[PDB]
């Protein structure tokens, strides 16, 4: 089979709880940029089951599935308490284990799969990464009907998904902020109750009016920047939670007395566990959260994409 690695290799044979998948969709995201041994990339997997190991239960050849790529070894503290995404020595498909940048891919254990019924491989693949990430980020915001949330860059891919999830799972008031009329509009279509265009308005001033000067109870900053970190924490209400997600090389700078006086919290997040995967997939399969705007490409265009869902 073909395989873009960090070639023409052989097709692994599934044994035990393993499952061999015929890749129908291999998502690509900025994380693949940080990657670029040998190792096949592709941590956003979706496809049809080609063959299952003798021990596999509940799945048959032909089944359409999406896969949770981050799998813990089980013995460490994080695996034991149920936070395997924070495993000390994880098995990460497309990162430290061969991924979906190929015609076929092996899933260590069948429990990490999710049978697709409503979505197709292309619509699901991105959910195994951005979906899990965003779903956990909303969970960390600790929202309820009495609260108001601010989603930064609400008109982007991650932003609209965050708005959709928050609207489908919390009942909180949602304020989306972006910088272009188009994005602001995308944020509104995602379900934001209020939208702000930082390019035509002072977001803080607008947020202060919307919340009657209280500020927001949570901010979800997906793919934060030095700019966002210096601006949006100012919008936090007392006890507000600033949920940061991403890997940009920037530092958090905040006056300590402001944190203690207002009991604010800065919380980080990046990926997610089986519970997060189950949640986003149930939502997507129910249509409560729509698939990301996607652009399909060929497997050979992998490098191009990195320079988007690849279809073997």
Q: Which of residues 118-177 bind its own copies (CB under 8 A)?
A: 135, 144-146, 165, 168-171, 173
Q: Binding partner of residue 129 among Zn ion, its own copies, none, CB under 5 to 8 Å per kind?
A: Zn ion
Q: Is the peptide bond before 244 cis (omega within 30 degrees of 0)?
A: no
Q: For residue 92, state whether it binds its own copies (rule: CB under 8 A).
A: no
Q: How far is CA 231 from CA 35, 59, 201, 235, in A?
A: 30, 48, 14, 8
Question: Residue 84 phi/psi, 5° resolution?
Answer: -60, -20
Is residue 8 a known part of a binding site? no
Q: Which residues, 20 to 49, sit near its own copies by CB under 8 A? A: none
In the complex with Zn ion, which residue's Cβ is closer, 121 or 175? 121
What distance in Å separates the CA atoms of residue 274 and residue 281, rounded to the nearest whole number? 10
- Which of 11, 270, 297, 306: binder of its own copies (CB under 8 A)? 270
Is residue 301 a known part of a binding site? no
Q: For residue 80, state whether it binds its own copies (rule: CB under 8 A).
A: yes
In the complex with its own copies, which residue's Cβ is closer, 262 or 294? 262
Q: Is 86 exposed, middle or buried, given 0-12, 13-18 or 19+ CB atoms closer than 10 A?
A: middle
Residues in touch with Zn ion (CB under 5 A): 29, 31, 44, 72-73, 76, 79, 87, 129
In the complex with Zn ion, which residue's Cβ is closer, 52 or 129? 129
Site string for its own copies, 185-224 (x = CB under 8 A): --------x--------------------x---------x
Asked if 239 and 144 count as a contact pair (C-beta separation under 8 A), the reply is no
- Which of 10, 38, 62, 249: binder of its own copies (CB under 8 A)? 249
Q: Binding partner of residue 31 among Zn ion, its own copies, none, CB under 5 to 8 Å per kind?
A: Zn ion
Q: What is the 3-state secondary structure (H, E, C) of 133-185?
A: HHHHHHHHCCCCCCCEEEEECCCCHHHHHHHHHHHHHCCCEEEEEECCHHHHH
Asked if 132 and 271 count as a contact pair (C-beta separation under 8 A), the reply is yes
- Token couple for 305: 């994409």
In the complex with Zn ion, which residue's Cβ is closer, 78 or 266? 78
């Amino acid at each position: 089979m073909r395989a873009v690695r960090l070639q023409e290799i052989g097709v692994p044979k599934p044994k035990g709880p393993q499952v061999l998948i015929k890749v129908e969709a291999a998502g690509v995201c900025h994380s693949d940029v940080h990657m670029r041994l040998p190792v096949t990339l592709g941590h956003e997997i979706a496809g049809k089951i080609e063959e299952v190991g003798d021990e596999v239960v509940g799945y048959s050849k032909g089944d359409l599935v999406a896969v949770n790529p981050l799998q813990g070894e089980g013995n460490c503290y994080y695996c034991r308490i149920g936070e395997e995404h924070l495993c000390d020595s994880p098995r990460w498909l497309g990162i430290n284990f061969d991924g979906a940048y190929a015609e076929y891919v092996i899933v260590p254990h069948y429990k990490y799969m999710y049978k697709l019924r409503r979505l197709n491989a292309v619509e699901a693949a991105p959910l195994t990464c951005s979906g899990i990430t965003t779903y956990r980020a909303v969970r960390k915001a600790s929202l309820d009907p009495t609260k108001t949330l601010l989603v930064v860059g609400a008109g982007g891919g991650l932003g609209t998904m965050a708005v959709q999830i928050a609207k489908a799972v919390s009942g909180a008031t949602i304020i989306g902020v972006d910088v272009r009329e188009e994005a602001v509009e995308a944020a509104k279509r995602a379900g934001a109750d209020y939208v702000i265009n930082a390019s035509m308005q002072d977001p803080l001033a607008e947020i202060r009016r919307i919340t009657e000067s209280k500020g927001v109870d949570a901010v979800i900053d997906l793919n934060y920047s030095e700019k966002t970190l210096s601006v949006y924490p100012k919008a936090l209400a007392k006890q507000g939670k600033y949920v940061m997600v991403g890997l940009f090389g920037a530092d958090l700078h905040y006056h300590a007395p402001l944190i203690t006086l207002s009991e604010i919290q800065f919380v980080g997040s990046l990926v997610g566990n089986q519970s997060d995967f189950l949640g986003i997939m149930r939502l997507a399969e129910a249509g409560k959260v729509k698939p990301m705007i996607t652009k399909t490409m060929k497997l050979e265009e992998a490098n191009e994409a990195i320079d988007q869902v690849l279809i073997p």
